[PDB]
Amino acid sequence: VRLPGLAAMRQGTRLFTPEQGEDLREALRRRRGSFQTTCEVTSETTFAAARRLREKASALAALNFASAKNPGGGFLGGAQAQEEDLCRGSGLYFSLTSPQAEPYYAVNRQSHSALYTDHLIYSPQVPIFRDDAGQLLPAPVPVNIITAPAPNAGAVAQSRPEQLPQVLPTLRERARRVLGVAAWMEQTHLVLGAWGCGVFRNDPAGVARTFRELLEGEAQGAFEHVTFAVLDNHPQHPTLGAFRRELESLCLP
Ligand SMILES: Nc1ncnc2c1ncn2[C@@H]1O[C@H](COP(=O)(O)OP(=O)(O)OC[C@H]2O[C@H](O)[C@H](O)[C@@H]2O)[C@@H](O)[C@H]1O
C-alpha cells in the first residue's frame, strides 16, 4: 500500500553528475542578486526547520547529510545520524533507491576515495510523515531534498593522510554544487546545517565558514532565506556554537 506522494517523488527524482558542475555554476549566476538574502542559525532538526519554512514558502529544499555508498547509510553506527532521521520520518529512502539515482552509489563505491565524487541526487516533494518524536503529522509536508555526501574526513585520516589538504577544497566545491542544484531548481528557501561534521568528522567551524563564503560570493543573493538548522544535544553545543560564531556577521538583521 504505497503512501501518497511517493510515486511522483520517485518519478521526479533526478541525478546530477560531476560533468554538470559548470551548468550548476551557471544556475548560480542566473540566480545571484535576486534577493536580499536573510539567514539564521537555529538548534532545530532539518525537518523541523523545513516544516517551519514550508508553511511560508513552497520552493523549499533541505540538504541530506548523505552516505556516499548506501542509501540511508545502511542505518549503521547510530540513529543520531541525520540521514537516518530523514529516512525514518519521510519518503526519502524510496527516492534514494530509485533506478536513476543508482549511479550516485555505484560510482561512489567504485571511486575508492573517501573524498567521494560530485554526484548529487535531487528528490522533489519528499513527504515528511512524522515529527522529531516519530509522531504522525496532521498532514504530510512535502519538501525538496538535495542529497550529497560531504568528504569523509575521518576515513581520509585513516587511509590517505596525503589527501587531508583536499578535504576542505572538496567540501567547498561540493557545497557550491549543492547550492547550484537549489538555484537550478529555483529554490528560494534552504535548510542547511553541519554537513559532514558528525559521522564524517569535518570541523564545524570550517564547514560553517565555507557556506558563509559561498553565500557572500558565488551564491550571493541567489536565495531568499537560508536556515542553518543544527541539532546539537550536547549541553555546551560545540557544533551549534561553531555555526553561530562563523555565521553571525552574515545572519545579522
Ligand atoms: N536530524 C538532524 N537534523 C539536523 N542536524 C542534525 C541532525 N542529526 C544530527 N545533526 C547534526 O549534524 C551533524 C552532522 O550530522 P551527521 O549525520 O553525522 O552527518 P555527516 O555528514 O557528518 O555523516 C554522514 C554519515 O552519517 C550517516 O550515517 C550518513 O548515512 C552518512 O553515512 C551532527 O553532528 C549533528 O550535530
Residue numbers in the entry: 29 to 281
Source paper text:
Despite the abundance of PARP1, most of the PAR generated by DNA damage is rapidly degraded, with a half-life of less than 1 min by poly (ADP-ribose) glycohydrolase (PARG). The radio-resistant bacterium D. radiodurans encodes a PARG homolog, DrPARG, whose expression is upregulated after radiation damage, so it might play an important role in DNA repair. Our study demonstrates that DrPARG is involved in catalyzing the breakdown of endogenous PAR and DNA repair in D. radiodurans. From observing the structural peculiarities of DrPARG, we show that although previously thought to be an obligate exo-glycohydrolase, bacterial PARG could exert both exo- and endo-glycohydrolase functions.
Therefore, we attempted to obtain crystals of DrPARG in complex with ADP-ribose. Crystals were found in several similar conditions, but they belonged to different space groups. The monoclinic crystals of DrPARG in the ADP-ribose bound form gave the highest-resolution X-ray diffraction with space group P21 refined to 1.97 Å resolution. The missing 11 residues (100GGGFLGGAQAQ110) from the catalytic loop of the apo-form structure could be defined as a loop region in the ADP-ribose-bound form. As compared with the apo-form structure, the bound form structure of DrPARG showed additional secondary structures: a short β-strand (denoted β4′) following β4, extension of β5, and an α-helix (denoted α4′) preceding α4. Like previously reported PARGs, coordination of ADP-ribose involves serial hydrogen bond formations and hydrophobic interactions provided by surrounding amino acid residues in DrPARG. The side chain of Asp113 located in the α4 helix contacts the N6 atom of the pyrimidine ring in the adenine moiety via direct hydrogen bonding. Oxygen atoms of the pyrophosphate in ADP-ribose contact surrounding residues via hydrogen bonding with nitrogen atoms in the main chain of Gln110, Gly224, Gly226, Val227, and Phe228. In terms of generally similar binding mode of ADP-ribose among DrPARG, TcPARG, and PARG structures in complex with ADP-ribose from Homo sapiens (HsPARG), the conserved catalytical residue Glu112 of DrPARG does not form a hydrogen bond with 1′-OH of the ribose″ moiety via its side chain. However, like in HsPARG, we observed a solvent-accessible 2′-OH of the ribose′ moiety in DrPARG, which suggests the internal binding of PAR polymers to DrPARG.
